[PDB]
Write a structure and sequence with these properties.
This is part of a larger assembly, with one copy of chain A (283 residues), two copies of chain B (267 residues) and two copies of chain D (68 residues).
Chain A (H helix, E strand, L loop, with lengths): L36 H4 L16 H4 L4 E10 L10 E5 L7 H6 L2 E17 L12 E7 L21 E5 L6 E4 L8 E2 L32 E6 L8 E19 L32
Chain B lengths: L8 E5 L2 E5 L6 E2 L30 E2 L3 E4 L5 E4 L8 H9 E13 L6 E11 L16 H4 L6 E2 L11 H4 L23 E5 L5 E6 L16 E13 L6 E18 L9
Parallel strand pairs in B: 3-11
Antiparallel strand pairs in B: 1-2, 4-13, 5-13, 6-9, 6-12, 7-11, 7-13, 8-10, 8-12
Chain D lengths: L2 E4 L18 E4 L21 H4 L15
Antiparallel strand pairs in D: 1-2
The chains are: A mainly beta (283), B mainly beta (267), D little secondary structure (68).
The structure holds myristic acid (MYR) (3 copies) and calcium ion (CA).
The site of calcium ion (CA) has 4 residues of chain A, from loops.
Chain lengths: 283, 267, 267, 68, 68
Amino acid sequence: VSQPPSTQSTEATSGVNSQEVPALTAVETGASGQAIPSDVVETRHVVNYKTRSESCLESFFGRAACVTILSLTNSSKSGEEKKHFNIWNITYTDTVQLRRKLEFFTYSRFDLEMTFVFTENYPSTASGEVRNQVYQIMYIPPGAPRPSSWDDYTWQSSSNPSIFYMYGNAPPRMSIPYVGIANAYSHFYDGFARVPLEGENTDAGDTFYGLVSINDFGVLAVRAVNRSNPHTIHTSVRVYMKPKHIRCWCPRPPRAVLYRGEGVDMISSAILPLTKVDSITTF
Amino acid sequence: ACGYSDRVRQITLGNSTITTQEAANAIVAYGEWPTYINDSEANPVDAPTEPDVSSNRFYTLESVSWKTTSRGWWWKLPDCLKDMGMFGQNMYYHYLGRSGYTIHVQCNASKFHQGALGVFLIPEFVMACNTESKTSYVSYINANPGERGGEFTNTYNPSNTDASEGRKFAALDYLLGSGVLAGNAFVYPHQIINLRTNNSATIVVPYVNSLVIDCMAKHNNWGIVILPLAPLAFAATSSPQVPITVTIAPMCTEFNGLRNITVPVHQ
Amino acid sequence: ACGYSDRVRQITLGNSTITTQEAANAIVAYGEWPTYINDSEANPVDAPTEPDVSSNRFYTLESVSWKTTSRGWWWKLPDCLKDMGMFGQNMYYHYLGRSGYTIHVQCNASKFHQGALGVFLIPEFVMACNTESKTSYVSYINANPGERGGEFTNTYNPSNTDASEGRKFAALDYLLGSGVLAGNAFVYPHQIINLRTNNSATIVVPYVNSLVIDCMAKHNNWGIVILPLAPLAFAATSSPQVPITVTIAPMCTEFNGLRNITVPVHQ
Amino acid sequence: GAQVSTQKTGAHENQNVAANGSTINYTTINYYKDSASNSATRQDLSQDPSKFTEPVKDLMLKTAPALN
Amino acid sequence: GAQVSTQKTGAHENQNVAANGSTINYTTINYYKDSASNSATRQDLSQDPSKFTEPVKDLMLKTAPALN
Ligand SMILES: CCCCCCCCCCCCCC(=O)O
Ligand SMILES: *C(=O)CCCCCCCCCCCCC
Ligand SMILES: *C(=O)CCCCCCCCCCCCC
Ligand SMILES: [Ca+2]
């Protein structure tokens, strides 16, 4: 049995008239302000039991956030074969909620919990019959051969980790180790994938700059394993990521404006975070 | 003490020495000091090259000028030193390089001036490109200015057409050219040179990365940014000007992977 | 031993490695090995720069060619390396430099060749100028050839008039261009590459001077000279040719007096 | 191989003291060979705000002149 | 009849030392009468590359002449 650390309690204090001035400081030093109630006013004694138990990075990142929505269609019509499967690039930039949070830190390190939610429906009036669907999520790491058709040899997965879902069952989920090839996950990257030497374009680099130019986690090749039926059916698969067993370094300000692309990039369309206030003296 | 003022301070590295009679303490980034790679944290197996004094000294960049119009400035480590004496040579002759630095921003005025520079040292300082026609579109040449470094502006005008204006950072001051309110740039190691208080800024910074040692010629760990949180001002003219000088000194530098020298694209 | 032949030998420094399966031992100049300046022998008071691996490695000079006509070759340390990678940088950025080296002269042929190269390492190798109109008349440019080094001849024709032919060494082989019979060049650390016996020559040499550390850009401590004591010969043609390669490696290098880089006169 | 631990004080629970009864114990038995598969790491309330609010070299104490 | 064992060091885990806490223990209870039904056999990192990289009769040591 143990007692979680509580937030500073307030010890009772009173007047003062010393040469000790906790009120004044010099933030030029780079040090934040330190004063607390006791230093400025007369306080009473207060026993604080409350804890920052929920601001613990593990709690703050303890949610299965949706990262992307993939679509695919099992159809029996002419050009509906390439539709019989889909390939998603692993990343959290597809959305903005989770992304922003992680984006609070320069580097991070964690294990990952993938959770998948499937939702199928009928497109046109082809509201007929179709047996139950069995999907396959295949993780194709960088370097592994990718599926040509919704059914070429690649879906054997003799080495690639694959899930097999039977629509209607509990949302398949699985865990992934910290796989980064670095000592930590890099969230930003003020560099280029390679060094452009003396005799090259006076623009070289514009193609390979940014974290995006060096990061690569492979892709998720989803598909329905059933064959094509009379009526066409459409499925939407949603990817959920929850970074667990985490720890991060170097805090940075939150993304204040809309996100453009995978990089920092802003759009002149929306770069006014704040809001006009009547007057500087308007409560 | 014998009057050991928090204001007066001396710094020495190699054969270089800074002094300052009006500083406001000094800060040590994230509370850690520069260190070398420990046998338990090492990666490259070749015996490293540790330049010591030959490269771990005080290199002074070409001063810039603070005007009532000035919007801000920026630089990149190790970039803004790639040409600094011996440090550079080592930096370029080696594939992998590691280093921390002591940043000393100088800027004296007079008891009759006003002004406040926010000197921030941001790790992994990635800025947005100036062209909404592409993403992460910045040329190596433009990303790595060197001793000159860049400057911040207060306007954002992307060149979706002119592809030679897109390949450069969109140094938007009120957003750090990152898309984050500069008002919170303080969550980074920093100091503020408020003219009525100090005239120097000293920030010691340790290597920072998701790796022990990295490839300097491709990656700039730190980024130095200076924004006038308080506009320069002088009772006399309505066009006052004061010099701002930046002197950087690398520390605990070590390199691995020696070969022929690296010479990047240039104009 | 497990057959530890006196002929086979490996050498390693920095990230460089020589090997040789036919050498004839190796010699250590005057019996002393390279060392650093000891606190009791020091002179310059600034903290020295000791490059270690970055500069104390095996740099290979452009090979030359041994012909039945070949008269000899020569080079100068540190000169013939002033352009060798990192070593050079350090050499030129510092006023004072100190170093010893491991010289490895290579030259393989076949059991059917004949020939014998006398590899001598002469300290303070001063040669006579080619002009009897002046004395000690040699230009810096000519005195310091570099990777190329000079060549010996077997004739002495001074240009008392043409002052551009005087400003160069009179590399008279049978006199070392010094005015001393080469027959006694053996009172210097040396080895002989006799083709029927060996194909390598290894001579480790320690810094030598009337001072602890000196100014490299002005003074060449050692001079490497190779004379065919036995003319190259091959049963086949009457114009045989074999390559001679010279690989030098500095050791225990340390420099004092760091400033802007030195760039000597050139053409 | 099970490991019992203290729960997170709930509604009608132990005075914040989290030191009242075994009725606040939860059991845990890791089932997989790979750590990655485990639940959230135990709540850690440690913290050093100073590396951010005061990474100054010479230390200054409230009651004193920030600039001496 | 359960047998506890060490897990595979994960993300924010014990310094590689795998010797920190019981929080790295996983339990195992075989349920079937036939061994074949069991999980993957325990990770075995033993190895003898020599039966392939050096199956030479007389042994030679690096530093010596491979051919004496
Ligand atoms: C069968 C499903 C396999 C899923 C494999 C996902 C690979 C994980 C890469 C890590 C992605 C999050 C890290 C990050 O971008 O910060
Ligand atoms: C320590 O583990 C001893 C207590 C065991 C109690 C049984 C728990 C139920 C089985 C755990 C999963 C085993 C999977 C093979
Ligand atoms: C050793 O096995 C003692 C621990 C027993 C804990 C109960 C585990 C749950 C039952 C195991 C399967 C039994 C099947 C008949
Ligand atoms: Ca408390």
